[PDB]
Design a protein around this ligand. Structure first.
Ligand SMILES: OC[C@H]1O[C@H](O[C@H]2[C@H](O)[C@@H](O)[C@@H](O[C@H]3[C@H](O)[C@@H](O)[C@@H](O[C@H]4[C@H](O)[C@@H](O)[C@@H](O)O[C@@H]4CO)O[C@@H]3CO)O[C@@H]2CO)[C@H](O)[C@@H](O)[C@@H]1O
Ligand SMILES: OC[C@H]1O[C@H](O[C@H]2[C@H](O)[C@@H](O)[C@@H](O)O[C@@H]2CO)[C@H](O)[C@@H](O)[C@@H]1O
Ligand SMILES: OC[C@H]1O[C@H](O[C@H]2[C@H](O)[C@@H](O)[C@@H](O)O[C@@H]2CO)[C@H](O)[C@@H](O)[C@@H]1O
Ligand code: CA
Ligand code: CA
Length: 686
């Protein structure tokens, strides 16, 4: 099936996500509405239940509200069973309408619907070529207090009705007991409570395995994607082990939430996206897009810098989920502002690299402050709005223009208020022009594109004051005027003859697993897939076609491989890099090293006899290690994803820049658990 098919649970670059706050969408079944001080059918008290449900979603998917827009994917609130208790935060009643207060990951939220309802949601959606993504919060349970076990539900965690444990009198040690985080450091925000939410301890085999079993359930229920919540609050190593659990069973596009603020650029965030095995929500993109189009605290030059930079920082920039606003920030549209800003940002997002995601109600010009004002009920299902139309015209492009989906980005013209960029993939091209300046037109001369000779009509049909473009020879465009607040989209598509790889997923897995390779010019006959120098052909290639290839991962050694393909004729494609071949099934292990003294600016890393440990390469060593919460300096620790049941030789090192200092004596040894977790305590050898 084409790379565009709804069945492609491995690629979302051609889709348009629609983020839905289930409760605030549509009440298709009032019989499941909560009651009492937890319910409010008017939806004035934004901290209560409003009635929104899966049934409602189905109806909207059925009357054409979503399909009409061009939406091809929906991200819904956490489906699992949340607490029932109505919490009181200073005279104000709060409920788990949001779904981020997990009680039992093996059951659904009655308010949203039954398992049967969820199954109906999947079918209705699938039938309408719409993919389903679900929010998942394995970082915690609910708001708790060890002192007052009467507070809410003591963060109680169940396993399909069976009570595992609570926050108070936590003998099993399921949760963390290190206080709350101040967001001071990564390690601080990972091992301490996020707010007052009962932090789960992933180092406990019970929790580990449990969450592993849970996710399978949902996977078996037909989901198409996963949205990992609070990923910067969970151990990277564990997450890696969790991802492999997914990829080694039922691969699905996964992206986590790594909150970033204005002008914030984290390297820890980059490395996560590149090694974790999952992608992330483009906060970088979102924040900059806001300064530029919203608050006007930066200009086009800042927009260009972001694009270029990101493309260099992320190994797979096209896997990043872009957005302009969400349930955690003020709605992009201000009650007094010009709507043209919101439309512009929308156009920009839809035609940019990554995976566009739209927070429900945007198309309706919903204004609102922070939580919970940004979570109002969808006021209307009108397709007459300008925003609704923009989405409607541009959305489909991601499907018919590989340039938009997998294309590169290039500034072709720029200035303080104007930005013209070129998306390009194979014989496909897209050129977009934006003029934020709402009061001044811009004269565009010297514009050069990759557009074939001829005239081009604005894809937006002048909806946003766009215009016609005249491209002479050499891609040189004729002089034109870019109206105030103008936005134009010109394009050119053609059949690609050369094999061009645009996507690959999953991005991490063990031998035997089937991976998906999408692109153009693959031909109709089976060819060859190269995993490094290892060639693959024949039966192992489950399926081959012009835009997609399904091939089983060869039994090569664990490590990082380069993926290339060649058609029947023998013509080779571009080289897709950064694919990780796991050594086998994964298990999360905690490494601890005692008496490891360092100098200010010098850190301790780990290395070993397996690819998951860098293979003895100081440049690929795990770290830097932690030393301040679970263990204090000179005692370091770290949660690492290693191959289960394997015998590993390891060592630690102190790294100062590129300068490496090896541990002395012989190599440490240990045999990884064939399931669940373990802790390795060792002393530094001099
Ligand atoms: O060549 C292939 C070999 O691969 C495997 O060797 C591993 C070792 O088992 C690891 O210990 C590590 O080697 C480090 C080593 O930890 C460290 O001691 C250091 O050795 C220094 C030594 O301290 C110092 O006295 C002096 O002699 O210089 C040495 C450095 O050359 O440095 C090693 C890294 O250079 O990694 C290697 C692989 O690189 C495998 O076990 C072997 O069987 C195999 O030969
Ligand atoms: O002509 C090629 C040239 O085009 C663009 O330059 C624009 C520039 O962005 C405008 O601000 C203004 O100065 O007119 C120029 C037209 O020459 C590209 O920015 C540039 O890379 C490229 O060389
Ligand atoms: O907390 C992380 C921190 O660890 C190391 O700092 C050590 C330092 O090396 C010791 O000499 C002593 O001062 O304790 C510190 C731990 O608080 C790294 O050197 C440093 O880069 C890193 O921030
Ligand atoms: Ca309902
Ligand atoms: Ca945590």
């Amino acid at each position: 099936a084409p790379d565009t098919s709804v069945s492609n649970k491995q690629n979302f670059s051609t889709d348009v996500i629609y983020q839905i706050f289930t409760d605030r969408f549509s009440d298709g079944n009032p019989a499941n509405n909560p009651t009492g001080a937890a319910f409010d059918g008017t939806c004035t008290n934004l901290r209560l239940y409003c009635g929104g449900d899966w049934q409602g979603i189905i109806n909207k998917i059925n009357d054409g509200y979503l399909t009409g827009m061009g939406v091809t994917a929906i991200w819904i609130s956490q489906p699992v069973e949340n607490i029932y208790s109505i919490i009181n935060y200073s005279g104000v009643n709060n409920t788990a309408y949001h779904g981020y207060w997990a009680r039992d990951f093996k059951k659904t939220n009655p308010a949203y619907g039954t398992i049967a309802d969820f199954q109906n949601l999947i079918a209705a959606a699938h039938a309408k070529n719409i993919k389903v993504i679900i929010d998942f919060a394995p970082n915690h349970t609910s708001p708790a207090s060890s002192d007052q076990p009467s507070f809410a539900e003591n963060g109680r965690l169940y396993d399909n009705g069976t009570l595992l444990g609570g926050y108070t009198n936590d003998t099993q040690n399921l949760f963390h007991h290190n206080g709350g985080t101040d967001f001071s450091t990564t390690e601080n925000g990972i091992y301490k409570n996020l707010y007052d939410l009962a932090d789960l301890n992933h180092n406990n085999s019970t929790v580990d395995v449990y969450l592993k079993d849970a996710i399978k359930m949902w996977l078996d229920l037909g989901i198409d994607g996963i949205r990992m919540d609070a990923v910067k609050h969970m151990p990277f190593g564990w997450q890696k082990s969790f991802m492999a659990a997914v990829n080694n069973y039922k691969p699905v596009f996964t992206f986590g939430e790594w909150f970033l603020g204005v002008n914030e650029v984290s390297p820890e965030n980059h490395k996560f996206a590149n090694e974790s095995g999952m992608s992330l929500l483009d906060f970088r993109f979102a924040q900059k897009v806001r300064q530029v189009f919203r608050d006007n605290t930066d200009n086009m030059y800042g927009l260009k810098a972001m694009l270029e930079g990101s493309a260099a920082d992320y190994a797979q920039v096209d896997d990043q989920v872009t957005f302009i606003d969400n349930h955690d920030m003020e709605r992009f549209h201000a009650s007094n502002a010009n709507r043209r800003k919101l439309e512009q940002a929308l156009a920009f997002t839809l035609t940019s690299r990554g995976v566009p995601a739209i927070y429900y109600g945007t198309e309706q010009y919903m204004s609102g402050g922070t939580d919970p004002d940004n979570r109002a009920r969808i006021p209307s299902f009108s397709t007459s709005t300008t925003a609704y139309q923009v989405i409607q015209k541009l959305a489909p492009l991601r499907k018919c223009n590989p340039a938009i989906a997998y294309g590169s980005t290039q500034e072709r013209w720029i200035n303080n208020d104007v930005l013209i960029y070129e998306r390009k993939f194979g014989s496909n091209v897209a050129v977009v022009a934006v003029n934020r300046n709402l009061n001044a037109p811009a004269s565009i001369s010297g514009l050069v594109t990759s557009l074939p000779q001829g005239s081009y009509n604005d894809v937006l049909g002048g909806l946003l004051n766009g215009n016609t473009l005249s491209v002479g020879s050499g891609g040189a465009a004729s002089n034109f005027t870019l109206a105030a607040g103008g936005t134009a989209v010109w394009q050119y598509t053609a059949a690609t003859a050369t094999p061009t790889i645009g996507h690959v997923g999953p991005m991490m897995a063990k031998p035997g697993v089937t991976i998906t390779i999408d692109g153009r010019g693959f031909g109709s006959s089976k060819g060859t897939v190269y995993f490094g120098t290892t060639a693959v052909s024949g039966a192992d290639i489950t399926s081959w076609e012009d835009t997609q290839i399904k091939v089983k991962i060869p039994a090569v050694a664990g490590g990082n491989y380069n993926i290339k393909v060649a058609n029947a004729a023998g013509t080779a494609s571009n080289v897709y890099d950064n694919f990780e071949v796991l050594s086998g099934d994964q298990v999360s292990v905690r490494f601890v090293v005692n008496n490891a003294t360092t100098a200010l600016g010098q850190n301790v890393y780990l290395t070993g006899s397996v690819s998951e440990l860098g293979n003895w390469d100081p440049a690929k060593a795990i770290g830097p290690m932690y030393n301040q919460v679970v263990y204090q300096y000179p005692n370091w620790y770290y949660d690492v994803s290693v191959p289960a049941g394997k015998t590993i030789e390891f060592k630690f090192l102190k790294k100062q820049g590129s300068t490496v200092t090896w541990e002395g004596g012989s190599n440490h040894t240990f045999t990884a658990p064939s399931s669940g977790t373990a802790t390795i305590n060792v002393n530094w050898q001099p």
